[PDB]
Structure formats: C-alpha cells, structure tokens
Design a binder for this molecule. Structure first.
Ligand SMILES: CCCCCCCC/C=C/CCCCCCCC(=O)OC[C@H](O)CO
Ligand SMILES: CCCCCCCC/C=C/CCCCCCCC(=O)OC[C@H](O)CO
Ligand SMILES: CCCCCCCC/C=C/CCCCCCCC(=O)OC[C@H](O)CO
Ligand SMILES: CCCCCCCC/C=C\CCCCCCCC(=O)OC[C@H](O)CO
Ligand SMILES: CCCCCCCC/C=C\CCCCCCCC(=O)OC[C@H](O)CO
Ligand SMILES: CCCCCCCC/C=C\CCCCCCCC(=O)OC[C@H](O)CO
Ligand SMILES: CCCCCCCC/C=C\CCCCCCCC(=O)OC[C@H](O)CO
Ligand SMILES: CCCCCCCC/C=C\CCCCCCCC(=O)OC[C@H](O)CO
Ligand SMILES: CCCCCCCC/C=C\CCCCCCCC(=O)OC[C@H](O)CO
Ligand SMILES: CCCCCCCC/C=C\CCCCCCCC(=O)OC[C@H](O)CO
Ligand SMILES: CCCCCCCC/C=C\CCCCCCCC(=O)OC[C@H](O)CO
Ligand SMILES: CCCCCCCC/C=C\CCCCCCCC(=O)OC[C@H](O)CO
Ligand SMILES: CCCCCCCC/C=C\CCCCCCCC(=O)OC[C@H](O)CO
Ligand SMILES: CCCCCCCC/C=C\CCCCCCCC(=O)OC[C@H](O)CO
Ligand SMILES: CCCCCCCC/C=C\CCCCCCCC(=O)OC[C@H](O)CO
Ligand SMILES: *C/C=C(C)/C=C/C=C(C)/C=C/C1=C(C)CCCC1(C)C
Ligand SMILES: *C/C=C(C)/C=C/C=C(C)/C=C/C1=C(C)CCCC1(C)C
Ligand SMILES: *C/C=C(C)/C=C/C=C(C)/C=C/C1=C(C)CCCC1(C)C
Lengths: 231, 231, 231
C-alpha cells in the first residue's frame, strides 16, 4: 500500500472519518427527541460510509486504471460510490432543517444523483475530450443545487425559529464554498487536465471531505436547531 | 460516433430529451403550490436522466459487446440504467395523482425494479436460450404492474376530483399502450430473435421513449389535476 | 448447470422462493386494510427478489471467479445483490410493526447497507488477509443492528397492542438467531477460511435464506398484528 505516494493522505482520511463516526455515535447515545434522532442518524451515516470508501482506496480496491491520453491513468472510483450516498444525505440534513417541501427534496436529490453519476461517467471515459463534456453537465447540475439552496431554502428558513435560521445560514455557506471546490480540483487534477499531481489532488480532496462531513456535522450537532421546541 | 448507422436516432433522442427537460424546467419556474411542485420535480427529472443516458449511447460509453449465438453482439446497456430510475418515477406520478396507498406504491416500484433488473440480466446473458427465460420473468412483472394500474388505480381515481379522474384515465391508457410495446421490440430486435436490425430497433425505442416521457409529461403538466383545490 | 455439485441446492432454493412468492401473492389478494397491504407488499417482494437471484446462480450468471490464495475461487456475487434489497425490507417489516421513529429506521437501513456493501467488498478482495478486515467491519455493522432490535425496538413494542408486542418478540428472536449464522458460514466457507466446501456452504445458506424469508413471512402474515384495530 505504501508504494503509492498518496497513501499517507488516504490513511489520514480513513482515520479522521473513523474518529468522526465514533464521536457522533457516542454523542447521539441517549438522545430521545425524535427530530434530533433524525439528524444524528443522517449525520453519523455520512462519515461512516466515507470511512469504508477511504479504507477501500487505502487497500487498493477502490482504484482502477483508465486509458486516456496515451497513458494508463489511476482513477479512484470509490470516491463516487461514497459521494453517491453521502451528498444526498448532507442535502437531506439541510432540507429537514428548513422543513423543505417534498417536491424540492426530490429535485435536490435527483439533481445530486445526476451530478455524481455524470462525474463518474466522466472519470471513466476513454476519449479525452469527452471527459470535459461530462464535467460540464455535472457542473450544471451542481449550479442548480446551489441555486435552490440560496433562492429556495434561504427564503423559508427566514420564516422559522431564529436558531433554525442562523444554523441553516452557516451550514449553507459552508456547503456552497466547499462543494464548489470539488469541480475545480477534478478539472486541474488527474481526472482532468493533469496539472496537479495525484498526491496533491488526494490531499485536497481529503481536506475537503473531512471539512464537508465532520466539520459540517460538528456545527449541526452542537446546534439547538436540531431539537423540537419543548418545555 | 458516426460510424454506427443508429447514431442519427441516438442524436435525435438526445436532442429531444434535452429540449423536453429545458421546457419543463422553465414551465415549473414560479410554481408555488406544494402538490404541483412534486409533479414538476418528478416529471422534469425523467427526461433529464434520459438525456444523460442517450448522450452516453451517442458517445459510445453506454454500449458493450455480448457474445451469444456465435457472434459479438452490440448491447446498449445504458437503456437499463435510464429505465431503472425513470420507470418508477413515471409510476410515482400516476400513484400520486390517485393518492395511492403506500403499500400499493411499494408493490409497483418493487415490481418495476424486478422488470428492469431481469431485463438487464437477460440482455447480458451469454447462453442464447436463457435470454428468453429472463424476458418471460420481466414480462410477468410488467403484467402485474399493468393489472394494478387497471384494477387498483382506476377504481380509486373514479372516487376523486373529476379532473384527477379524467387525467389519470388518459395517462393510464397512454402508459399501457406504450409500455407494452417495449417487450415486443426487445424480443424481435438485437437483444432477442434478431429479426429487426439494430438501426431500426434504435429508432423504435427513440419514438417510444420520447412519447412515454416527454409526451406523457406534456399531458400531465398541462392538467389542472396537479394543483390542490383552492380558492 | 449440473456440472457444479451445489446445483441441487440452488435449484431447491429457486423452487422454494418461487412457491413462497406465489403463496404470499395469492394470500394478499383482496386484503383491503391499508396497514395490512404494506406488510403484504414488503413481505411478498422479499422472496420474489430472492427467486430471481437464486435463478441467476443456478444458470451461472451470478457466479464469478476471484483469485486469492493462489487459486481461482468461485464466488457467488448474486447473494449480495439479493441481500442489498431484501435485508432492509425485512428490517422495515420489523420497524413498521413497532411504529419505529424515522431516525431509527434510517439508522437501521444505513447500517444494513454498510453490512452488505462491506461483505461484497470482502468477497471480491484479492489480498487474502484483507478479506477478513471487511468481514470484521461488516460484523460490527450487524452487531449495531442487533443492538437496536433489542434495546431500541423491544422497549417500544412493550407499550403497544399486545398482539403487536408478542408477534414482534417472536420475529425479533427469529431474526437474531438466523442472521447471526451468516457471518459464521462466510468465515468458515469458500469466501473465508475454506474449511467447509462450497456445496455444503450453499446448502447452509439455502436453509438460512428460506427460513429468514419464507419462514419469517409465514409467521408475520398469519398474525393479527398486521391489521389496524377496527370494529
Ligand atoms: C484547518 C487547519 C489546517 C490548515 C491546512 C490547510 C492546507 C490545505 C492544503 C493545501 C495545498 C498545499 C499542498 C502542498 C504544496 C505542494 C506543491 C509543490 O510544492 O509542488 C512543488 C513541485 O516540486 C514544483 O511545483
Ligand atoms: C408523431 C408523428 C411522427 C410519426 C412517425 C411514426 C413512425 C414510427 C417509426 C416506425 C417504423 C418505420 C421504420 C422504417 C422502415 C425501414 C424497414 C425497411 O425498409 O427495411 C427494408 C429492408 O431493406 C428489407 O426489409
Ligand atoms: C426444518 C426440517 C429440516 C431439517 C434439516 C436441517 C439440516 C440443515 C443442514 C445441515 C448440515 C448437514 C450437511 C450434510 C453434512 C455433510 C458433511 C460431510 O459429511 O462431509 C464429509 C467429508 O467426506 C468428511 O468430512
Ligand atoms: C476505527 C472505527 C471505525 C469507524 C466505525 C466503522 C463504520 C462501519 C461500522 C458501522 C455502522 C454503525 C452505525 C452507523 C449508523 C449510526 C446511526 C445513528 O447514530 O443513529 C442515531 C439515531 O439516534 C438512532 O435512533
Ligand atoms: C442513489 C441516489 C439516491 C438514494 C440515496 C439516499 C439519499 C436519501 C434519499 C432521498 C430523498 C427522497 C425524499 C425524502 C424526503 C422526505 C422528508 C420530508 O419531507 O418529510 C417526510 C416525513 O414523512 C415527515 O415526517
Ligand atoms: C428520485 C431518484 C433520483 C435518482 C437519480 C439518479 C440519476 C443517475 C444519473 C446518471 C448516470 C448513471 C451512470 C451509470 C454508472 C455505470 C458505470 C459503470 O459501472 O460502468 C462499468 C463498466 O466500466 C462499463 O460497462
Ligand atoms: C460558482 C462556483 C463554482 C464554479 C466552478 C466552475 C469554475 C470553472 C472555472 C474555470 C476554468 C479555467 C480553465 C483553466 C484550464 C487550462 C488548462 C491548460 O490547458 O493549461 C495548461 C497549464 O496551465 C500549463 O502549465
Ligand atoms: C441541452 C440542454 C441539456 C439538458 C439539461 C441537462 C440535464 C442535466 C442537468 C441538470 C439537472 C437540472 C435539474 C433537474 C431537476 C429539476 C427538478 C424540478 O424541476 O423541480 C421543480 C420543483 O418545483 C422544485 O421545487
Ligand atoms: C432502484 C429502484 C428503486 C429506486 C428508484 C427511485 C424511484 C422512487 C422510489 C420509491 C417509492 C417508495 C415509496 C414512496 C411513496 C410515498 C408517497 C405517499 O404515499 O405519500 C407519502 C407522503 O408522506 C405524503 O405526504
Ligand atoms: C423497495 C425497493 C425494491 C427494489 C427492487 C430491486 C430488485 C432488483 C431485481 C433484480 C436483478 C438485479 C441484477 C443485478 C445487476 C448486476 C448486473 C451487472 O452489472 O453485471 C456486471 C458483470 O457483467 C457481471 O459480473
Ligand atoms: C398485454 C400486452 C403486452 C403483451 C406483450 C407480450 C406479447 C408477446 C407475443 C408474441 C410472441 C410471437 C413470437 C414470434 C417470434 C418467432 C421468431 C422466429 O423465430 O421466426 C423467425 C422469422 O420470423 C423468420 O423470418
Ligand atoms: C414459479 C413462479 C416464479 C415466482 C414468481 C416470479 C417473481 C418475479 C415476478 C414478479 C413480480 C410480481 C409482484 C411482486 C410484488 C407483489 C407485491 C404485493 O403482493 O402487494 C400486495 C399489496 O397488498 C398491494 O397493494
Ligand atoms: C440500497 C440500500 C437502500 C435501498 C433499499 C430499499 C429498502 C427500504 C428503504 C428505506 C428506509 C427509508 C425510510 C423509510 C421509513 C418510513 C416509515 C415511517 O416511519 O412512516 C412514514 C410514513 O409516512 C407514515 O405513514
Ligand atoms: C440512507 C441510504 C443509506 C445507504 C447506505 C449504503 C452504504 C454502502 C456502503 C458500502 C460499500 C459500497 C461498495 C460499492 C460496490 C462496488 C463493487 C463492484 O461492483 O466492483 C466491480 C469491479 O470488480 C471493480 O471495479
Ligand atoms: C453475537 C452473535 C454473532 C457473532 C458472530 C461472530 C462470531 C465469530 C466467532 C469466532 C471465530 C472462530 C475462529 C476459528 C477459525 C480458525 C480457522 C483455522 O485456521 O483453522 C484451520 C482448521 O480448523 C483446521 O482444520
Ligand atoms: C462528502 C463529499 C462531498 C460533499 C463531495 C462533493 C462533491 C461534489 C460537489 C462533486 C462535484 C463534481 C462536479 C460538479 C463536476 C465534476 C466532478 C465532480 C463529481 C467532482
Ligand atoms: C422511459 C422509458 C420507458 C417507459 C421504458 C419502459 C420499458 C419497459 C416497460 C421495458 C420492458 C421489458 C420487458 C417487459 C421484458 C424484456 C425487456 C424490457 C426491459 C424491454
Ligand atoms: C435473506 C437473507 C438474509 C436475511 C441474509 C442475511 C445476511 C447477513 C446478516 C449477512 C452478514 C454478513 C456479515 C455480518 C459479515 C460477512 C459477510 C455477510 C454479508 C455474510
């Protein structure tokens, strides 16, 4: 495993997702409020699935070689199996916080599915120029998600409990900044133009993934907004 | 891409699914009624996922070669990844229109999963005679779905708002006729007996797919039945 | 098909899952109570998906060869495609019986996903020692599920209708005993240490699968607990 230079970042990612999972699991012990239980379940699942996929990349299972540009290129496909399930869970935490209507939840989850599925097709496409077609369609689906989070969700939170509104605004801003960096890393890294080497690309996705999953969860699960209003 | 004769129908399919997606997206702008939003989300997602899969077949990603009958046969597997998600969404539009109970929705979606999953196993099976075993099991699951749509759903719609009943009856009849043609095309085309060439088979599925997705959606989203009754 | 010694158990499994599906389908004819319909839909789907996967193993589609330990080893991967959908359906029957809160249902289904997904990664891993790492992570996710079924669910059932409590207690005990045997069979069989031959391993999983699906369903669907209380 140590033969690949990016191993150290996969190992550190594995450890941090593991530790984040155990922390949120212990913290959610004994919570009995039904609304809080939903947020603890969603939020604890997200680093638990990322732990399994980081471990699969560390041990070499989650890597394949894709020929493009006359080379055999190493593509970590397990990233997409993680993000297929973890990105809609993160969006569901936001939508539940603002009591989003069911049609908006379905639009967000379906656009997220299209973003990750087209990202995976782009990562495994053997004709170099067509990789960037799939990157553009996936980016258009991310822009729809970010538009709804600012022009659908923001206007509803501002009519709810003040602690729900302030917590949503922080997590919305966290999400828009961190998720917007992923298409840029892909475009400049090994899957795209090849300017940044795989070892630095792996470091960048590790910092983004721990921030967007464990950092986001620490903010949400310390908030009063996840409990029902009660005496 | 132009080396395959069926390319023109894949390109036309891509364009029509793309145009249908953009039309329904613009039309659903500003709709604020929660019931209408659910139907716009479901109905807009369906040509958006079909657009991505038609594009994957145009560019060659969604094609594999399966050896059977002593030949290498071209099988477009991306059709099944589209229909795995788009066929239950179309059934959910019908079920929501009639306020179907949750047990019936689960039976319809699960039978649909079995229909498409066994269709895919049949399309990729290398022993020729066994392809038709999977076709028969998939057809039996389609007959269950059509039985419920006529002997479960029809009897509930007739007790609801008149505009919900008339709109359901039209979309039910559209769905029964168009979906019944898919097993016949598969059986006579490249996946089955091989009587109709792949270029004509691709034309037939394009006409069916645009009719069952964009045609169905134009009927539903122009109806008063998708809005709640309000003053 | 008869060239593999385990064929007879795959054929018997196919038949029993087929017969169980047809029995539950006929029995659920005419049931009109909405709560009972949910349990019939969930419970009938489970042997129907297992029938398709047993048939795929009988015909040879659901088998692949994985090199580990210097051999090419036969791994029936279709077991995991069955259990990915059938194990959360069985857990949903239990959760609905006790009216479990939505956060607990999500935790159970997500832990179940992690159990089966890591089991599949373990079954297809080519480095022998790492197969047992994935077995341990999957077993830890099963222990979480069993903890919730005894220390979350048992305490809620005891506050509901007496027939719901007694039926849950029986099905909980059935589930804990039969599901705990699966990791032991995997560890001693072809996927693991290789002490028990594939033909006996296949017999063991057939007896467990029919008991945990058709046996469990016969107990549940004969119970008064699946109907709403009504005059
Ligand atoms: C939260 C507290 C922790 C804060 C931590 C945030 C750091 C995020 C990582 C960043 C990029 C740095 C990557 C290291 C740069 C190596 C690039 C390089 O030097 O390549 C040289 C090559 O030889 C010729 O260009
Ligand atoms: C809605 C308004 C639009 C209406 C449009 C509906 C048409 C649907 C397509 C049909 C089949 C026609 C396929 C073309 C037939 C070619 C078959 C053929 O001629 O093969 C000849 C071969 O050389 C010896 O058999
Ligand atoms: C519900 C009523 C039905 C009750 C049925 C429950 C049986 C479950 C199966 C069990 C294991 C028996 C497997 C047969 C044992 C064969 C092992 C063997 O003998 O291997 C010999 C080898 O030559 C040297 O060890
Ligand atoms: C080094 C440590 C390794 C890291 C751990 C390995 C992760 C894979 C194992 C298990 C799934 C465990 C459960 C995941 C679901 C927990 C959901 C939850 O917390 O639900 C709370 C809610 O309140 C309930 O009602
Ligand atoms: C593979 C990619 C897709 C699967 C990945 C899993 C991610 C979560 C799934 C779906 C959102 C579906 C809609 C669920 C929103 C319901 C929330 C709500 O509005 O409330 C309903 C509840 O009944 C009030 O108590
Ligand atoms: C309400 C639920 C909404 C659900 C929204 C989901 C939409 C998914 C969209 C797109 C891409 C699907 C791509 C399928 C990925 C297959 C890639 C693969 O595995 O290819 C293997 C091999 O290399 C080649 O044969
Ligand atoms: C709204 C927040 C989300 C927005 C996210 C989308 C932003 C995409 C931006 C830019 C593309 C810049 C293209 C630069 C690529 C040129 C690569 C190249 O070929 O140059 C070779 C290299 O630079 C020689 O050293
Ligand atoms: C040539 C044009 C190409 C075709 C376009 C590329 C398709 C892939 C891109 C994006 C997903 C965009 C969003 C799909 C989900 C829209 C859901 C919706 O409309 O929801 C309305 C509801 O009212 C809300 O609350
Ligand atoms: C991969 C194949 C499966 C996944 C493909 C995605 C297709 C849509 C999924 C599921 C239907 C599940 C049941 C949902 C029906 C609920 C509708 C209802 O009855 O109303 C509930 C709501 O709470 C009242 O406001
Ligand atoms: C409530 C939710 C209900 C959900 C109902 C879903 C039931 C799905 C049924 C069947 C077929 C599954 C077939 C699995 C397809 C794998 C095909 C494949 O990819 O094979 C690749 C390669 O060629 C070989 O190793
Ligand atoms: C209820 C609505 C849905 C019903 C959908 C199911 C209908 C299936 C019907 C028929 C099979 C006809 C079989 C014809 C195939 C014979 C092919 C053959 O071998 O003939 C060679 C060729 O004809 C020499 O030119
Ligand atoms: C030898 C016999 C072979 C075995 C049979 C082949 C299985 C694959 C075929 C079909 C799916 C049929 C329907 C599966 C879903 C049934 C759900 C149900 O029973 O729902 C009842 C509920 O009351 C409703 O409202
Ligand atoms: C691929 C692995 C995952 C997919 C496999 C399919 C298995 C079933 C799925 C999900 C449970 C999601 C939560 C559903 C629990 C809702 C039940 C409930 O509490 O009641 C709600 C209803 O609105 C009151 O009438
Ligand atoms: C609320 C919903 C909760 C959902 C919880 C789901 C968590 C799934 C976890 C893990 C493993 C995923 C493993 C992906 C399996 C891919 C195996 C494969 O097909 O590999 C093919 C080939 O051999 C190699 O390239
Ligand atoms: C709580 C209910 C669920 C608990 C489920 C987890 C139980 C796992 C137990 C034990 C491992 C025993 C290990 C024995 C394996 C040693 C194999 C070996 O190498 O021995 C060679 C062979 O015995 C020469 O004939
Ligand atoms: C837990 C990990 C998270 C929040 C990952 C987020 C990932 C995305 C927002 C990925 C976006 C992509 C594009 C928009 C285009 C090209 C490739 C992707 C998949 C990296
Ligand atoms: C959007 C596309 C739609 C509505 C596609 C519908 C597809 C089916 C009804 C497919 C049916 C099949 C059979 C019943 C048996 C054999 C093969 C299939 C998958 C073509
Ligand atoms: C219908 C079939 C059922 C109920 C199957 C249950 C399967 C499991 C509980 C499987 C468990 C596993 C482990 C806990 C670890 C290693 C391998 C598995 C997937 C066999």
């Amino acid at each position: 495993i140590t033969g690949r230079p990016e191993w150290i970042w996969l190992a550190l990612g594995t450890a941090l997702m593991g530790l984040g999972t155990l922390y949120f699991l212990v913290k959610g012990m004994g919570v009995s409020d039904p609304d809080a239980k939903k947020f603890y379940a969603i939020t604890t699942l997200v680093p638990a699935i990322a732990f399994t996929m980081y471990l699969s990349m560390l041990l070499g299972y989650g890597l394949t070689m894709v020929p493009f540009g006359g080379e055999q290129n190493p593509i970590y496909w397990a990233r997409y199996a993680d993000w297929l399930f973890t990105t809609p869970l993160l969006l569901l935490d936001l939508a539940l916080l603002v009591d989003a209507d069911q049609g908006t939840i379905l639009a967000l989850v379906g656009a997220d599915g299209i973003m990750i599925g087209t990202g995976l097709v782009g990562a495994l496409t053997k004709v170099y120029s067509y990789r960037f077609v799939w990157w553009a369609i996936s980016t258009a689906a991310m822009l729809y998600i970010l538009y709804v989070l600012f022009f659908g969700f923001t206007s509803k939170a501002e009519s709810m409990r003040p602690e729900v509104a302030s917590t949503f605004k922080v997590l919305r801003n966290v999400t828009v900044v961190l998720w917007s960096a992923y298409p840029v890393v892909w475009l400049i890294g090994s899957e795209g133009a090849g300017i940044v080497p795989l070892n630095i690309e792996t470091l960048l996705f590790m910092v983004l993934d721990v921030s967007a999953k464990v950092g986001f969860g620490l903010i949400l699960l310390r908030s009063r907004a996840i409990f029902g209003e009660a005496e």
